[PDB]
From a paper:
The [name] (HA) protein of the influenza virus is responsible for receptor engagement and is, therefore, one of the major targets for studying the virus-neutralizing mechanism and screening neutralizing antibodies (nAbs) against the virus. After binding to the host cell receptor and being internalized into the endosome, the HA protein of the influenza virus is cleaved into HA1 and HA2, which are covalently linked by a disulfide bond. Subsequently, it undergoes a low-pH-induced, irreversible conformational change that is required for viral entry through membrane fusion. We resolved the cryo-electron microscopy (cryo-EM) structures of [name] [name] (HA) alone and in complex with the nAb antigen-binding fragments (Fabs) and identified the HA head-located epitope for each nAb, thereby revealing the molecular basis and key residues that determine the differences in these nAbs in neutralizing [name] viruses.
In the HA-Fab complexes, the densities that are responsible for the HA trimer and the Fab of the nAbs are clearly defined, revealing that all the Fabs bind to the head domain of HA but target different sites. The 1H9 and [name] engaged sites are located on the side of the HA head and their Fabs point nearly horizontally from the side of each HA promoter, whereas C4H4 binds to a site on the top of HA and its Fabs extend obliquely upward from the HA head. The most parts of 1H9 and [name] Fab binding sites are overlapped and span the RBD and vestigial esterase domain (VED). The BSAs of the H and L chains of the [name] Fab are 367.8 Å2 and 359.0 Å2, respectively. The footprint of [name] consists of 14 amino acids. There are 10 shared amino acids between the epitope of 1H9 and [name]. In the [name] Fab-HA complex, two additional hydrogen bonds are formed between the residues HA N133 and A149 and Fab Y55L and K56L, suggesting that [name] has a stronger binding affinity for HA than that of 1H9. The epitope of [name] has two more polar amino acids (negatively charged E81 and positively charged K152) and is, therefore, more polar than that of 1H9. We found a unique G144E mutation in the HA of SD001, which is likely responsible for its escape from neutralization. Glu is negatively charged and has a bulky side chain, which created a repulsive force and steric hindrance with Y34H of the 1H9 and [name] Fabs (interatomic distance <1 Å).
Residue numbers in the entry:
A (entry chain B): 1 to 118
B (entry chain C): 1 to 107
C (entry chain A): 52 to 317, 328 to 347
D (entry chain A): 200 to 248
The structure:
Amino acid sequence: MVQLQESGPGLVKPSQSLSLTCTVTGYSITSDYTWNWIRQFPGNKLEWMGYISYSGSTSYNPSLKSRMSITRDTSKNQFLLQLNSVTTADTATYYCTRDGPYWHIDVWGAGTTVTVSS
Amino acid sequence: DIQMNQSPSSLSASLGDTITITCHASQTINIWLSWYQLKPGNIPKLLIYKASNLHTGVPSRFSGSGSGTGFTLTISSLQPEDIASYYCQQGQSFPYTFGGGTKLEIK
Amino acid sequence: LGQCGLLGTITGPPQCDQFLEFSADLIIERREGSDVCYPGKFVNEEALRQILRESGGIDKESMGFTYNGIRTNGVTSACRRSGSSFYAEMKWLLSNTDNAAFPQMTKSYKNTRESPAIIVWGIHHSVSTAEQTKLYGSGNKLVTVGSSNYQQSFVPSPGARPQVNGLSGRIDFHWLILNPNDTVTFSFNGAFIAPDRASFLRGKSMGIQSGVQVDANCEGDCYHSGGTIISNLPFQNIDSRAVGKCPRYVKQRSLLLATGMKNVPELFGAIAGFIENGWEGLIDGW
Amino acid sequence: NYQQSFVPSPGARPQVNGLSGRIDFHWLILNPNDTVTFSFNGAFIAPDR
């Protein structure tokens, strides 16, 4: 039973950073699958951010090339999302997901809603 | 990049009817799709991977198939727990893109 | 194909997911083409490579099997896409309770088109009898594969082997052909690697092998491994495994053909005859 | 010049015009003075000439 749960603040001021994490229980984040974050635009429209591998390699969305980082924590079974230089558009719902193979995506987290306005 | 034009944007169905939804990858990806239901109000669920094999634990009522640049599921004999929104994902070439999303409606 | 080994398209390894259903008029295999990700090999495999160098592509279709009492997603740690996968086209019929039993199966498929299939199944050679109980159960194992023109009843070989990049046990894939309306039946009580899609053909192409680049601006038809020959001359000393519509390989390298008279500076006896020398002060006529 | 020890394949097949089970016939050659021996506990279709 692999469960993923986001957490973070309520209101974020523009031109600042955003730090969310996802806790993962039931499965080590170093056992061999990657780990994604996925937003939700207003209007029910999905988009891909990037992953961190079980070893710790990352790829990113090539229109979020220089403003995004994703790291992890092997101790309390977590990984942490970081994004900066934000505008009004980034009010979304962020979904920490466990990826599957190139076949698909398996495990979805429930999500949480962010708000970026001053 | 690759564009995923899931059409139509919404259509209306009663109880017991067979309906299709049809994604349209803009470039050859040839087998790689998966179908996700995520409704506003719950966690998402998995339905189909490899564009044919249904996920383990799904009720066997639901199916889909396809290859090339055209993919399609099949849902009939609807339920009260059937109403959601339905997304398709191309797994060929990075970055991941999803589709527009169809909204399930009672006529 | 690049890093795709031509007989892998029929099986789907991670290096060939972008070529599972291609279409070509000129296929090219590279020196680095690998056909597998688990350690294993094909059978009669130079012949099968000669069906496909002209087939112009492939077109799979499903086959529709369904299993119960039995898992289907045992995974290997070398066919890696993000993690532990298997081939795209095949599955892994493994036992449910890990040492209790395994029921005997029987499945079938009838070809229904105008074209012959290319259907390929798999037999799994366990590394021991200690890891053929863990994977499958007890008793002897036999995979019966019969059609109209075909009857084999293959059997595994539980033995220790050297390791190829981590794993000792092999997996062998054999292949048959169906004709229209014809039917195959697979039956087994262990160690079988079923197909899930059959495979059809398209048309007419040619195959080459090279080590130089794919070009697109140049017009030519004689394709060997060090490039392309283009000439109006009937003879070439360039290569003798040149495929296409080439000139013909000789062993000489120069063979000059005259196009003037005998050069006499200063059968009928006038050129080098009773007219002694040529003229160099004559520039219009001969 | 020959030693095989063949074995049957009890399995279900498609039907060719009524029957499912097949029968396969193999063939050898003898030389002068040479001798063949057939031995079996079932499922054999002997020659007679």
